[PDB]
Structures are given as C-alpha cells and as structure tokens.
Amino acid sequence: GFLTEVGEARQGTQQDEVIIAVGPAFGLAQTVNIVGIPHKSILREVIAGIEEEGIKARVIRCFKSSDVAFVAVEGNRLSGSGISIGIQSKGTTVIHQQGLPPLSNLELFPQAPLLTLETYRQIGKNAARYAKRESPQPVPTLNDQMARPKYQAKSAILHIKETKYVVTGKNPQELRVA
Amino acid sequence: FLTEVGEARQGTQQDEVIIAVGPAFGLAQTVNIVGIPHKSILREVIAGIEEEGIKARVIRCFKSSDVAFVAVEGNRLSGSGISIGIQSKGTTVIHQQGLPPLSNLELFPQAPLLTLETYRQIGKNAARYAKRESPQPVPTLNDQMARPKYQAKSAILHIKETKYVVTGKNPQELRV
Amino acid sequence: SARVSDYPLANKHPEWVKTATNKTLDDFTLENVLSNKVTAQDMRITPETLRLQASIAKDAGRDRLAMNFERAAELTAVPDDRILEIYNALRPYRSTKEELLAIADDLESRYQAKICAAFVREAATLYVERKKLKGDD
Amino acid sequence: SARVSDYPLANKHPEWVKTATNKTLDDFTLENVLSNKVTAQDMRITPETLRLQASIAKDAGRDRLAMNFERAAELTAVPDDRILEIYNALRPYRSTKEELLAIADDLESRYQAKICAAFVREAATLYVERKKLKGDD
Amino acid sequence: MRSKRFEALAKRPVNQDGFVKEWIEEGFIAMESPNDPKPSIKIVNGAVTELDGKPVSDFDLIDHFIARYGINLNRAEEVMAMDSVKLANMLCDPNVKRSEIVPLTTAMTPAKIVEVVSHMNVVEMMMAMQKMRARRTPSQQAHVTNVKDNPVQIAADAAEGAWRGFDEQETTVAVARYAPFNAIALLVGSQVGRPGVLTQCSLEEATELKLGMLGHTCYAETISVYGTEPVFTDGDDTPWSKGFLASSYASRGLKMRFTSGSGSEVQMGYAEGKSMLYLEARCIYITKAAGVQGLQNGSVSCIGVPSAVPSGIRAVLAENLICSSLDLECASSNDQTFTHSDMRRTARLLMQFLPGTDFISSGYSAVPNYDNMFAGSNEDAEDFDDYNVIQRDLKVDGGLRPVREEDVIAIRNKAARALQAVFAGMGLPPITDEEVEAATYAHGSKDMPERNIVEDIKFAQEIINKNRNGLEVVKALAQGGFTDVAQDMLNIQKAKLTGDYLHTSAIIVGDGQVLSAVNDVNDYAGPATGYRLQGERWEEIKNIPGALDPN
Amino acid sequence: MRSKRFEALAKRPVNQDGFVKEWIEEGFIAMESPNDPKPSIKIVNGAVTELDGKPVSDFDLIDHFIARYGINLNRAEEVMAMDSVKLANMLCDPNVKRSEIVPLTTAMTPAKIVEVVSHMNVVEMMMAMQKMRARRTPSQQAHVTNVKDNPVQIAADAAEGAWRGFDEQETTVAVARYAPFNAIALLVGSQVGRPGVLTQCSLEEATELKLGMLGHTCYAETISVYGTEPVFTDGDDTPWSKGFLASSYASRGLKMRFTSGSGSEVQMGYAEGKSMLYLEARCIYITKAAGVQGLQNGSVSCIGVPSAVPSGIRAVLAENLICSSLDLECASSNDQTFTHSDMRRTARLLMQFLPGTDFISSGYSAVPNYDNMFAGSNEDAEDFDDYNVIQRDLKVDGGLRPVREEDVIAIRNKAARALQAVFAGMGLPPITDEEVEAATYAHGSKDMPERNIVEDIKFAQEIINKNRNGLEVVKALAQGGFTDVAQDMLNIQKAKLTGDYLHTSAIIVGDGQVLSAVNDVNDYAGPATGYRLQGERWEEIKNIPGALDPN
Ligand SMILES: [K+]
Ligand SMILES: [K+]
Ligand SMILES: [N+]
Ligand SMILES: [N+]
Ligand SMILES: [N+]
Ligand SMILES: [N+]
C-alpha cells in the first residue's frame, strides 16, 4: 500500500499545481495496468513529469464514478490550475480542464495497452505546461488496430472490477504517496 | 519441328519408347501452360530416353485429346510396351501396355510445376521401364496453388486442342 | 393532410416548401448566394415543413417519428445557443428541478413550444425520482 | 416385407440378418476369427439381407435405391473376378454387341440375375446407336 | 515432448483474439441468459404498471421512456399472448409480408422481441433480415480519416470512396480542434466523388451539433444511447436529453440516427446481470421511443465483448434483426476490429452482407487501417478487391463496385484541387500543388507531406469562433473555378430545407433524388421478388480487374 | 504516375486467382445461360418421348438413362405445369415440409429443377438447404494424405482427424502402386481415433473396387459421372457401366456414392454449349437414376472453373441444393483450393457450413495442404482453431470440436503402434520405433524419416496380386497385442453384413449405431424445429482453447 488517504481533498488556491486523479481501485484491489505496468511506477512517472516543469503534483482518489472522464472532472474541480490527469487502474489516461464538458478533454489516451512509462512521463510533463497556460505539442498519437481485438475483453473485466468500488456521493480523498 | 510422315506401326523390340503428343502439340500451340516451348520439352524427353541407351519415337494422336488415351494409343505401338503422353498444355504421363487406361506407372498432374529438367527425368524413367527396371519414382511435385492459378487456363488450352480431335483417325508417325 | 403519395415534397410539391424568411427552393441559386440575395439566415427549414413530414411519417405508420418532427417544428423558433443550453441542462446532474421547470415555462410562454415544454417537465419529475439533478451524484 | 419401422435391422431384428455361411452377427468375434471358426467365406452380405434393405428403401420412398439393392442382391452370386470382367466390358469401346448379349444370357442362365441381364441387354442396344462399341472410337 | 501440429496451430492469428468463459452474474454473456426477464406487460387506464417482470414502482429512466413511448399499448396485450415461436417463424416466412409484421413487433416489449429472435439460427435471421430491411435497396457507409487529420488526403479518400459506391461517409479527428477542416474536406471530396453522398463528423455531442448548425455536415450518427441507467449516466445523457437532441437535429433539417451496440454496458461496468442482447434491445426501444428514424448497432465499437463469448456474432446479427423488425433503419456495424483472423472477420461480415441491410457496414474503412481513427475497421481499403470478388462470386450487391485506376486518380486529383481552391478562397493555410499531387496518388498519410498543424488548428478554430458557415465554402468554390462543385454543395445544403431525407433510411442518389423506406418500399415475397442484383448493376459488379476474355 | 492505393491492391493474394469473362459458346458460364434448354417433358404409355426440348430420337446415353430411370413420371407433367417461382418459394418456405416437396422435385426434369433454383439468391438457398438435407444431423469428411504416401503418417493423422470429429475419411496416392498401404493405414488409424469412422481410398475405378473386395476400405466415393457424353467417354465410362459398378459395390456390402461437380465438362473440353449448373443437374439425375444413395458435388476438383466466372460460388450452392432436393445424400465439396485469399475461401465454405449438409466438407484436409494429394483443400489442419471459433461465434454445428494436445498425442502414437504391428505381422517393410515417435509428434511429412518407397511399392502391389485380404490385418493386430482395434475391424465388417449403412447419408456413431436419413429424419419446420445445436454438444463447441475465466 504505497497510497494513504489523508482526508477529503480541498480545492487548490493557486495556479501552481496539477491534480492526478485515480480510480477507486488504483493501487489497491488492482496494482498494475492492463499490460503489467505497476501503479507505483506509473504515478512515479506522472509526478516526475509535472515537477520537472516546476509544478506541484497532488494525488486524489475519486469515488463517485469509475469512468475516466468523470474521475478527471472531479480532479479539475479541485485543481488550483484547473488542470487534471485522470487515470483508471487498467491504465486509460486523460488530461482534463476545469470548464470543459465532461466528455471533452485536452488530450486522451484511449488505448492503454500502448502506454509506456515514458508516455506517462510526457503526460505529466504536458499537464504542467497546460497549467502554466503554455500550448505544448500533444503527446504523439499511439494507435493500433489490434489493440481492441487483443485487449478489449480484458479491459471490460478490469473496469467491471474497479467499478465495484464506486461510492455515489463520496467526495475525493487526497492521497499521500509513499 | 514435327514433319507429318505416314502412319506409325508396331515395334516388336523392347528397346524403344514412343512419345505420343496431342493433336496440337507443335501446331496450334507451341508452348506449354507456362511458356516452355514444345521444342525444348520434346528435346529433353528424347535425350533422357536415349541416355538410358533406349530408342525414342514420336507419334501424334488424334482420337482423343485426353492425355491418358493419347498415351494408350502409343503404348500399343511401342515395342517395349511403355510410352509417354504429353498434351500441348504440358500434362504428361508414363503409360504401359496392358494397364487400365486411367491407370499408369507415373503421372504428372500439375503441368505448371514441370521444368525441362523434369521432362528429361521422365524420359530416363520411361526407358528405364522399357528395360524392365524399377527406377526411383520421379520426385512428386505438388503446389496447392497450382489450380487456383492455372486451372482456368488449363481448361481453355484443352478446349482448344480438343478442337483438333478426329474420330477414327490412327496415329501419325513424326520426324523431328 | 400530407400523405405518402405527397412524398418526396421536393418532387411532388416543391412549392409547399418555403424557408423561415419565406424564400423558395428556386431562390437558392449560385447567383443569389454570390450576390448575397440569400444567406444562411434564409436557409432554415420551417415548422410548416416539419409538420408536413410529421403527417407523412404518420401515414407511413411511424407515430413516434412524427412526434419527433412535431417537437422539431417547435424548436425551429429557438435560437441555436438556446438549443444547446437546454440540451445541456437535461444532461445528468446539471440542473435543479426548478431550473428545468423554468426552461419549460420559457419554452411555452416565449416560443409556444408546448410539446417540448411538457417533455421538459416530464424529465424534471422523473429526474427527482431517479436522482439525476444537480447534487445527486 | 421389411419396413422403415424394422430399421435399423441391427437394432430391431438382428436375427433377420446372417452371412455367407449361415450363423449370427454374435458369432463374429476375434476368438472365432483366430481359431478360424469364421473366415472370409463367412463375411459376405447375403441377397436375403439386400432384399430386406430394398424393401425398406422402397418403404422410405426411394424406389431407385431399392432397384439398386435388388440388382446387388442378384450380383452377390457373381464371382468377384467376373464382376470386374462385366464392369470392364461395359466401359467405352470394350465390347461388341454380341459379346454384351452373351454376358446378359450368362447372367440370367448361370446366376439367375434377370434384372442385371436386362440391364446389360439394354446397354447393348444403346451402345450400337450411340457408337460406344469396340471400333467406334 | 511437443506436438508440431499444435505448435503450428498456436501460431495462428486467431489465437491472439480475446476469448472468455461466460460470466452470467456480470452480464458477460451475449444472449439467452438465465437472468434475462420473462416477457410481460400490465396496463391500467392506458399506463403501463409492469414491464417484463418489473413493477412501475421500480422503473428507471429507461423503463419509463420505453413504457410511455416505445411500445404500441393498443395491441401490446394481444401480441404478448401470441406464440414467440410462431412470431419467429413469421419473421423468416417469405410469404408473411413485412407490413403484416411491423404492426406486431412495434407492439412487443423488449423482452418479447428478444425471446422471438432467440429461437432463430443465423440462416433464419438472414432470411428474415432481407425482408425486414426498411429500404428496398441496400447501401454502404465508410470511415474517411487519417492519423494526421490531413485535409487534402481526406478530400481525396472521400472522392474515391464515393466513386466506389459509399452513400454515407464519416470522419473524425486525431486532434480535436481539427474538426472543421475534416468536416469541410469530407463534404467537398464526397460531392466530387458523387453528388448526393451524405457526410458526418463524429465528435462530442454539443460540439457536433454546433458543427452541424454551421452547415459543415449532412447528418449525425454517433448520437449514443445505453442499455442501463448507470451506463447511460456515465455516457453523460438520459433518454430525455438524447430525445431532445434528436429533435434539435431535425429542427435544423439534419438527418440523424442514434448509435448503440451489444456489450457496451459490460464494457462500461454495469450490465445489471443481463445479457448483451437484452440490454441492446432496450437501446433499440429507446431509439424507437425517441422518434429517431434509424440506429447504428451490431455491437459497433464494443465488438470485442460479444465476440469473446459464445454465440456473440449470432447475437450481433440478432440485434440488427430486432432493429429492422421494429421498423428502424439499421446501419449494421461491420466497422470495427475484433480479430486478427481474416477467416473470422469474413464470417462476421457475411451475416449482414448476404441478406443486405440499410448500410451493410456503418464504417467500412476507405483508408488502410493504420489511418483509421476509430481504432480500426472490420474491412479496410486493402480489402476492396476481395469485397468486389465476393460480390461477383455470390451475385450479391454489397453496395460497392470495381473501379478503374485512371478514374480514381482523376477523381482524387479533382477533389484535392477543389479543396485547394476552397482553402485559398477562405484564406486558410495553403494547400500546395505538391500536396495535391501526393493526395492524388496516396494510399495513406504515409505518402503525404507533413503540414503545419499549428496554423491549421488556428484557422479551424476560427471557423467555429467566427461562425464561418457552409455558404463560405460554396462561394470559394464558385469563385475559384469550381462552379460545378459549388452547385453540388449548394444542392446538398438545399436538402436541409425540405425535410425529405429526414425519413427512415434516406440517402440521396442520381440527380438529387431522395431514396428512403417511404418511396423505396421493401416488397420482399420470396424468390424472384424484392430487390434483385441484375441488369447493368450486375454487369458493373461482374467487371472485376483480372477477368480476361477466354478467346 | 502510379496510384499507391492500386499498387497495394495489386499485391493482394486474391489478385493471383484465375478469373475469366463468360464464354457462353464453350459453356464457360456458371448458370442461367441463354443456351440452356427450356424445361419440357412428354410421356406416352409411361415412357418419355421428349425431354427438355429434345426428342427421344436424338437422345444420347445420358438422356436415355435419366429419361428411363431418373424421373418420377407419375407426377412429372403435374410439376412441369407448376410455376418455377412458386416452386422456388416452396423450397425456402419453412412451412412447406420436405416430405411434401420431395415427391415433386424428384418428378422434375433436369432443366426444370435448374430453372427453379436459379430464381433464388444464396440466403434463400441456405434457408432451403437446411430443410432439404437428408440427414437431420450435419457431418464432416476429411482428407488424410502426404506427398510421400508415407504409411505411418497416414495412420497418425487419421486417428487425430477421427478424434476431432470427422465421420468419414479419405486418402489417395501420389504413387498408384502405393495404394494398398495407404488404405490399411487409413482404416486402422481411423478406428483408433473413433470406431465407426468410414474410410475410402480414391483410385482408378477397377482398382478401387478390387481393394474394397479385399476388405481394405469401408466405402467408395470417387465413382465418377459426367454431364455430356463425350466427357463421360473420356472418363472411360457410360451411365450403364457406372450403374453396374454401383450395384457391384452394394453386392459386396459397401456403401458408396457417385462424384461429379460443376465445371468438369468445361475442364475436359466438351460442354456442348451448356452452363455448368445445367450439366451438373444431368449428373445429379444420372446418380438418382442409377439408384445411388448419395453424391459428392459442388464443383469439387474443378472448382477453379466456376469460381473463375460470375455467380460461380452461388452455382456451387445451387448444385448442392438440387442434390438434396432430389432426396440424395450430399457430400458438399469444400475440399479443393481455388483461391489465394482467406476471405474468399471462407465465403465459399459458409454457403454449406451455415445451413449444414450431410457432409459440410467432402474432404477437409486433416493435414497441412503441402501434404494434400488432392492438390490442396479449401481448409487444412492449420485452420482447425479458426473452424472451432466460428462454430462458437455463430452457434453452428460444423461437425468438429476443440481437442487437447495430450489426447491427440496419445491417439497419434497408438495409431503408429497399431500400424507398426500390422507390418510386422504381415511381413511388410518394418516401421522403426523412430518413425513411430516422429509420426506421433509430426505436423506433416517434413517431420518424417524418409522410407524406401521402391521396397514398399513392391509389397504394396503384392497385397493386390496375392489377394491378401483384411483378415491378415485383423490377425496381424490381434497378435500384436491390439485386440480392441482388431475387434473394431470386425464391427465394420459386421456393419457391411447388415446393410443398414448402405442407406441414404449413413454414418456410424456411438457404439456401432447407424445414423442415416432413415432413422435420423430431418423434420425442419422453421425456428425452434429441426436439428438445433444445444445441450452437451453446445458445451463441447463452447469449450475452446484460450477461453479464460474472468472470475
Ligand atoms: K459509423
Ligand atoms: K471427398
Ligand atoms: N456525437
Ligand atoms: N448496448
Ligand atoms: N474411384
Ligand atoms: N459435372
């Protein structure tokens, strides 16, 4: 357990951070993404990418929904910069922005099996630039026609499992990273 | 080429091998299904035969374009009892007198796979049989895509050579 | 009034088709577009046309399709930005029950969109029951 | 006569069956094969069995099949080598009309194969007309 | 020791596909689940009090919407009492008219129609589909996208697609803000290919409607609905918000259909213990209830879910059959990847291809799959020749046709030139003669010069923010030497004023003639009746490349 | 300048296939030819005087045979007067019983039934096929061969095939003289896999019957018939010689069927200007007239002919439909290569696989195609996994099932052992223990030690010349310690003694239980009736390898 809940997350007050919002099972019932990458390693890279850009990283666990879009939305409501990064246990990631529609985003990574620790790094790096009102080049598109044929069934199973931890009305818990 | 010449007859000596070609081999058609000219083919067939110290004869059949029957008309005029049937499109068979028409000693059912080297190996084996020997059967050639690629062309080429079939016409000897 | 035999309108009764600004199908020519005799504002389907298609849909045995066209007919009077606001207000957790009822009163009083107004009030009632209003997530 | 209700004979009426040496399907064990109490002479389908199957085929609405089985029943009496002889004689350009009629007479007088004999005579007449006799190629 | 026979099998592409054993409690079962509700309905004073086992007190938004507007209550009790086997028999009986069936199916509850079709095998379902299809003439729809959102390539691929036979074409973006360019490029290219082809640009709901309001699209399809309340909620809509959106598109004279597909609730975590087919049936009724004319279904993007379990592909044909049987236009999927095996993907396609549906594929990829922004389609550009060969082999009209390289080059070139004039006329980032040439002979984006995305996105966003409408495209074309294309564009815009193509299965063929289920009534009555591939259309399909004259 | 789109398409495998434009004059047209005769018949005192526009005076041997034995004259005039469209409708109508149709179809002339089925599309044909199929339960047949005529491999592969589900298995030889060995190998291996599996060795007519008289085969299938007199003649037979042969097989208690297939007359030079389907209809009637219970058709070995032309694959399904419609068992081809494309060969196979026929494939290669001595099958050993996945996808019984490697290996080894003992007992060229283990884990002949063919070739011809019968096989096994296998041999002979398996569609399942059209009647009457994949069989098909349990 490299993640500890330290209480209901409060809203940021300055444009100096980026919130990393993870699903209700991240680092708990599930500890690796759809292709085996550990959650500990993933969070490590996202954070290093953000901090590397002179921005603080604050992690929270979301409960009202397991859908990555809404997980991210919970994050952008509390982010001091309005910028957030949503991540499901299986790996799916999105960069959201306070003000945008829930199903709209700045950048989306819809094929988790293709993500690497380096991608997770650039993502944290880009999230920070957005926070600083910079217009960074989007993380290069990663697409593969056989991603679904090989992993969609597995994706559905992993999401079904994480979704069992959804708690309606439960506010986000800020997390202390070991 | 292949000069007309009168009709052929019996042999009486088992030191020969007859080559029966369809009613278009060297005429309406001059190459097999894959381009190999009839000239070259017949040449290597004769060479393989004479190589075994056997004599080779060539006759043209007209009663049927079916390679099995074309070979039959020949194995009955061959002094050795053995013969070789070859259609213009290339299909070839090694037949022996006294054996059922649709039966044979060796068959080459996929003409597209035959090479001039294959036609010479067929020759020595034929003459090999003429000498009452049990030669190693010519290496089997089988390509599962031979039909997908050439069966349609095969039918068309046989339809054309078949137009030269003439009922009741005896085989005519041939001089190369 | 209109039936399957009157369809397609463009082929059977083109004159029955006029635009919001009362333009005809023939008025829309490259010449008129270039000289601005006709503009985007002129190219708008009318509530009359949609109600005609509704009648045709009904004649073809498609009652719900016709009802959809009846709603569309009322919505032609609602501005683009207002259409988008109302749609978003109907999405999960966006509105309070009173805001939805206010949209309904507005649709009715300002646009005479009675069917759509009833549609919104119906949603309001069920949204309370199924907890899809602001604060229920 | 045997009907569809009697089929399969192996399950419904095993006793109705027998072999070219009179016995039972039961007596067909490895033991008897080794001791030679049962040999090849004992493993030949009988005309009696084929006529039963013919009756069943007919009952099943398959008259041609039945006729086939009837001809087969007759042919059980003809020696294997002779069967091959008659088959070859019927192939293209193999026989003269007279040789075929001789085969028919032999089939009828020596084997009581009346149906097959008629079958051969029929062939002989048509072979003359369609020129499929020795020398017609 | 290892068996060389099994080592060979282990290497087969099909063994890379995802397969799973049924998980009934979580709905991971395609159809015929023991958890599915028994059909039933109770009505008191004109209002439903019970629907398929569930009391009105426990109705969710979906039950309410379906109970109030998705079923003909006047005959619901009568049909419910009819034998489901007899009804299934009626569906595939060539002598029971489609017009005799629709009055019954539209009175069935979701569970009832599912029970009916579940008694059928795929052969019976296909026999039924050819009859229940709303439009007499089958059609096709293609995806036109590329990894770079290159507008020049989109226009070219779109022209080629329309020339090959697609009557509807769809694009989307690799980069969100590129949307306007993609939409305009798709529309221009499609009209150059064949005036009349309808175009759509799939985006976030609010964004897509806005784009349509500006006149850069002809229709919308990815208007989603879901089978369980929690899933619909994560989808950010309710039956009412989507029903309103439907009427909103119609109020702007734009054709539209909803989109659903078996397995979405499982993929999204809440199947409420029901089979994929039953939940999809709820989506089909939500569509009927909303008054939407058609639906894109047959699993669609979640094809990896039903295909993973038994009878999943049969379930896919079943949901398409239910759609058509309920008198809705059916854009029958065959637009998404689910297998590494050519044999398997072909079997999946033939279920709809053989009988014919309103749109056999709701997304055949008109570009090689590496450029498909919907994560890959069941068929792509490299399958074009195979598709035409099968049409010829079986005498089946699959909606496409063989084409000459010379004609495609000219059509793609004209599309690129027309769009070049559009960009110059509207003051958008230039399209160079080099780019026009590349798009003409390209296979995919790998053959296209890299563009300045920063400049494109800037002007693309300006189109939205400054509300630059479709008439601006018409002008640029007419003022740029493409009067012919400008007229065709104006003609497609004029279609939005009549409401004719808003009807069930509507497409636009020939000289601007609308062709829908209303004026192209499917009249199937067995052999030698109904739509038949013949005449010049048959000659067109027979003319495949490589067919040499025997003589 | 070349289009990269077209350069990519030009490389596709399908474009290596042979295609040709129709050549009506030479019969190079699959069906619906203007040259085909109009249906007609005239009867006087119970004898045909006119058949399909031709007077008895002009009849060739085929006409005479069909006219005198192939048509049910009692209702010929009645059915001739019926509208062909109505008849086609009756064929696919689920509510017109097979038993009501058979008396009518068997009374039609060849031209009449061809006219009837030609009014149908492939969906209708499949809808009809599932109903007309003689045996209620669908089955499958496999090819078991190798380029070296290697006996040990044949035995091993035969056992696996039987274990996978094949109820009939066929072998042939690259070297005729090898025949005797191939047969014995096939028979022993098959019974090891599953006692009851019928075996055949395809050779020259006179030669095969002899092999059967010796007791080295269970049945015969390649008993050829042709559609035109000249072709039949080059085939070295007449309707009477083949009819006699058919009765000869039965007189020896051996099950048998004829073999034909569209395109043979074209391939052999004399189509007499008729379409392939019409000429194939004459072959089907020849089969009916001879009293033969079944037929192997659907182009078979000449598949490259009809596939080359338009509607050729549809024509292949039509000929299978005519066969079943004439109350004949149908072993429906899908046993020969015609394309380089996986997509194309799958579409061709589904025509029979979906509805189901007596034998979906009359020769699915149970070995990799390079080892297939029939010049390649439409499916081979490497497609086993895909075949099982498609069965599961559509809930269709294709006659095969998923297997476990350990079981196959065990089965493979026992077969090599059994055959090894046989060669020892009969004093034939020994089978080293090295060959036994190789054949056990082999995928093809490439993994087998080269043998002395010339040595065996002499012992092969010895068995025929020294009339060595199958009892030497039964004994050579008994002594070798193989009793059960030896007994299973007798059980086959016992079946030959009862004559039960001589009936239409007969196969032997379970404990020597005959399963034919007589005791396994197809009673199809629409959805929920007739054969339905369910119960234990369904579970067997669902349990594929790789199916991971989610929870
Ligand atoms: K689509
Ligand atoms: K076979
Ligand atoms: N959308
Ligand atoms: N769904
Ligand atoms: N044979
Ligand atoms: N034939």
JSON list of N, CA and C and ligand atoms in Angstrom, two decimals, chain E residues 141 143 170 200 221 296 335 362-363, ligand 1:
[
{"chain": "E", "resi": 141, "resn": "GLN", "atom": "N", "xyz": [-21.67, 2.46, -45.92]},
{"chain": "E", "resi": 141, "resn": "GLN", "atom": "CA", "xyz": [-21.10, 3.65, -45.27]},
{"chain": "E", "resi": 141, "resn": "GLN", "atom": "C", "xyz": [-19.62, 3.40, -44.97]},
{"chain": "E", "resi": 143, "resn": "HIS", "atom": "N", "xyz": [-15.64, 4.97, -43.37]},
{"chain": "E", "resi": 143, "resn": "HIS", "atom": "CA", "xyz": [-14.89, 5.87, -42.49]},
{"chain": "E", "resi": 143, "resn": "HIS", "atom": "C", "xyz": [-13.86, 6.52, -43.41]},
{"chain": "E", "resi": 170, "resn": "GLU", "atom": "N", "xyz": [-18.10, 8.92, -43.11]},
{"chain": "E", "resi": 170, "resn": "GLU", "atom": "CA", "xyz": [-17.89, 9.51, -41.80]},
{"chain": "E", "resi": 170, "resn": "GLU", "atom": "C", "xyz": [-16.43, 9.78, -41.47]},
{"chain": "E", "resi": 200, "resn": "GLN", "atom": "N", "xyz": [-20.72, 13.05, -42.26]},
{"chain": "E", "resi": 200, "resn": "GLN", "atom": "CA", "xyz": [-20.83, 13.32, -40.83]},
{"chain": "E", "resi": 200, "resn": "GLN", "atom": "C", "xyz": [-19.44, 13.43, -40.20]},
{"chain": "E", "resi": 221, "resn": "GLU", "atom": "N", "xyz": [-24.54, 10.60, -36.59]},
{"chain": "E", "resi": 221, "resn": "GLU", "atom": "CA", "xyz": [-24.83, 9.20, -36.27]},
{"chain": "E", "resi": 221, "resn": "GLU", "atom": "C", "xyz": [-24.41, 8.73, -34.88]},
{"chain": "E", "resi": 296, "resn": "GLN", "atom": "N", "xyz": [-27.46, 2.86, -35.47]},
{"chain": "E", "resi": 296, "resn": "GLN", "atom": "CA", "xyz": [-26.24, 2.17, -35.84]},
{"chain": "E", "resi": 296, "resn": "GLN", "atom": "C", "xyz": [-26.02, 1.17, -34.71]},
{"chain": "E", "resi": 335, "resn": "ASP", "atom": "N", "xyz": [-17.79, -2.31, -38.84]},
{"chain": "E", "resi": 335, "resn": "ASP", "atom": "CA", "xyz": [-16.95, -1.13, -38.89]},
{"chain": "E", "resi": 335, "resn": "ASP", "atom": "C", "xyz": [-15.84, -1.10, -37.84]},
{"chain": "E", "resi": 362, "resn": "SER", "atom": "N", "xyz": [-21.40, 0.15, -41.26]},
{"chain": "E", "resi": 362, "resn": "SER", "atom": "CA", "xyz": [-21.64, 1.51, -40.81]},
{"chain": "E", "resi": 362, "resn": "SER", "atom": "C", "xyz": [-20.25, 2.06, -40.53]},
{"chain": "E", "resi": 363, "resn": "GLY", "atom": "N", "xyz": [-19.32, 1.75, -41.44]},
{"chain": "E", "resi": 363, "resn": "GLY", "atom": "CA", "xyz": [-17.95, 2.20, -41.27]},
{"chain": "E", "resi": 363, "resn": "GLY", "atom": "C", "xyz": [-16.86, 1.37, -41.91]},
{"chain": "G", "resi": 1, "resn": "K", "atom": "K", "xyz": [-20.34, 4.77, -38.39]}
]
